[PDB]
């Protein structure tokens, strides 16, 4: 169950400032480049 | 343990066997030692029998 | 008690069984004969003994209700002689033969509320109820009693009606065929009372052969089925060969002259029309049932034909009850004890508010 969950792919969007494990958590997206819901 | 007698009961079974094995044998070499270990494995208590059965595996190598 | 006691009235084809739930054996057993002049309000033994100025009439004779006035009469004599209880303090479970129709059910609740005045009620399929007494709620049930016969497949706690196979076989057909063979073999006999006595002899004493071939050869070499019977009146009836042809008619059904399938053919076609994916799950508990256990030797022929029926890749696992003669009564009595069965139990309020037709919807 734990090892079954283990086999996944970890995200990119690496950060320079994280030296202790930087996989990725999105350093604040752009306003237009989240469209079709931000638009309305 | 009655002054530790539980642990000191299987002792004085090896030691008492070798009380005679380390007195009878002094300077022996050759087959007179293989005749000096052929009456100390002849015992009814299987402890001394198995201890001298272990010495005789060495000496007959 | 802490809640009002449930009552069960089982209107069977040969006899009527009434009583209170809380017992395994019925409180009263009467015959189902209703005397109508050729007493004038009494249903039971006294009508049967006074049948010389009263003509014959049965409310349930086929195995289901084929006379409604007559059923209301036996229901009224059930309320007064068999019970005389306070009816509004007794919810009643009725039981009829497998698969009650909707209009029959509407007529049933319609008269159950007027002749009896029930506070709440239940109406039930028979073979499922009998299976619930055999200790399972899935399986295939060959219910052949004194009335109608069905091979009912049931899975998911209620019967699968697309493969339910109704088969015309009854105790009516049995007594008529007994008259036919007893007058055909050569004997002076037309009277009704010895017909009942010899029918009891065929029900208890007569042998249901395990196969045709083996018993044919045994009786052909020297008749080993031969047995004498000595009544209090001094009846003398004997030969093994007449006893060998009497229950022979269900091995191959065209032996009598009737057209409907035999036991192996009906149970094979019933288990064939039920789905393959639940077939082996259903076959892990196949049951024997019905009033024909009056002689326990029809079970042997049944389990031999059932092990011949299914392929050898899943073996027989048949439950053979060491009693199934009171099967319908114990079905009712085990069913009504449960607390969850009370949620399918319909009251009088809904029956007044949305018509009688909701007794088909809530109770099914």
């Amino acid at each position: 169950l734990w090892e079954a969950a283990l086999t996944y792919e970890a995200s990119k969007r690496r950060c320079w400032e994280r030296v202790g494990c930087p996989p990725g958590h999105r350093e604040e997206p752009y306003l237009t480049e989240a469209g079709r819901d931000a638009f309305d | 343990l009655r002054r530790l007698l539980v642990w000191t009961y299987d002792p004085k079974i090896r030691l008492k066997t070798l009380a005679a094995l380390v007195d009878h044998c002094q300077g022996r070499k050759g087959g007179e030692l293989a005749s000096a270990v052929h009456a100390y494995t002849k015992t009814g208590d299987p402890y001394m029998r198995s201890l001298v059965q272990h010495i005789l595996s060495l000496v007959s190598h | 008690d802490d809640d009002i006691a449930a009552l069960v009235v089982d209107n069977g084809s040969g006899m009527c069984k009434a009583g209170f739930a809380g017992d395994d054996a019925p409180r009263a057993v009467f015959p189902s004969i209703v005397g109508r002049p050729r007493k004038d309000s009494y249903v039971g033994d006294e009508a049967q003994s006074k049948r010389g100025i009263l003509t014959l009439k049965y409310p349930i004779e086929h195995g289901i209700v084929t006379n409604w006035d007559d059923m209301e009469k036996i229901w009224h004599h059930t309320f007064y002689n068999e019970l005389r209880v306070a009816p509004e303090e007794h919810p009643v479970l009725l039981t009829e033969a497998p698969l009650n129709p909707k209009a029959n059910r509407e007529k049933m609740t319609q008269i159950m509320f007027e002749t009896f005045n029930t506070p709440a009620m239940y109406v039930a399929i028979q073979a499922v109820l009998s299976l619930y007494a055999s200790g399972r709620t899935t399986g295939i049930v060959m219910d052949s009693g004194d009335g109608v016969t069905h091979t009912v497949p049931i899975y998911e706690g209620y019967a699968l009606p697309h493969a339910i196979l109704r088969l015309d076989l009854a105790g009516r057909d049995l007594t008529d065929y007994l008259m036919k063979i007893l007058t055909e073999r050569g004997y002076s006999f037309t009277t009704t009372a010895e017909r009942e006595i010899v029918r009891d002899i065929k029900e208890k004493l007569c042998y249901v052969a395990l196969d045709f071939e083996q018993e044919m050869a045994t009786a052909a070499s020297s008749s080993s089925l031969e047995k004498s019977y000595e009544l209090p009146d001094g009846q003398v009836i004997t030969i093994g060969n007449e006893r060998f042809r009497c229950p022979e008619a269900l091995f191959q059904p065209s032996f009598l002259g009737m057209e409907s399938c035999g036991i192996h053919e009906t149970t094979f076609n019933s288990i064939m029309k039920c789905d393959v994916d639940i077939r082996k799950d259903l076959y892990a508990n196949t049951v024997l049932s019905g009033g024909t256990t009056m002689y326990p030797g029809i079970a042997d022929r049944m389990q031999k034909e059932i092990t011949a029926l299914a392929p050898s890749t899943m073996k027989i696992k048949i439950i053979a009850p060491p009693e199934r003669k009171y099967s319908v009564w114990i079905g009712g009595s085990i069913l009504a004890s449960l607390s969850t069965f009370q949620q399918m139990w319909i009251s009088k309020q809904e029956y007044d508010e949305s018509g009688p037709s909701i007794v088909h919807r809530k109770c099914f």
Binding site: - | - | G135, R136, A284, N285, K317, I318, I319, A320, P321
Partner: protein, 59 residues
């Protein structure tokens, strides 16, 4: 076979004792006769525990 089913009844006792089941000899005989009909045993495991609860409900 009557020789064999007494010995298998006796060996059947020990594995009911060492598995720490509630059964003694009498209840073992009742349960072996009950499983012989064809009942699923995983269902019987619940009715025995419910009887042993509601027995203690009286006392």
């Amino acid at each position: 076979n009557l020789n064999a089913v007494r010995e298998t009844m006796d060996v059947l006792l020990e594995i009911s004792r060492i598995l720490n089941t509630g059964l003694d000899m009498e209840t073992l005989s009742i349960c072996v006769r009950l499983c012989e009909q064809g009942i699923n045993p995983e269902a019987l495991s619940s009715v025995i525990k419910e009887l042993r609860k509601a027995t203690e409900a009286l006392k």
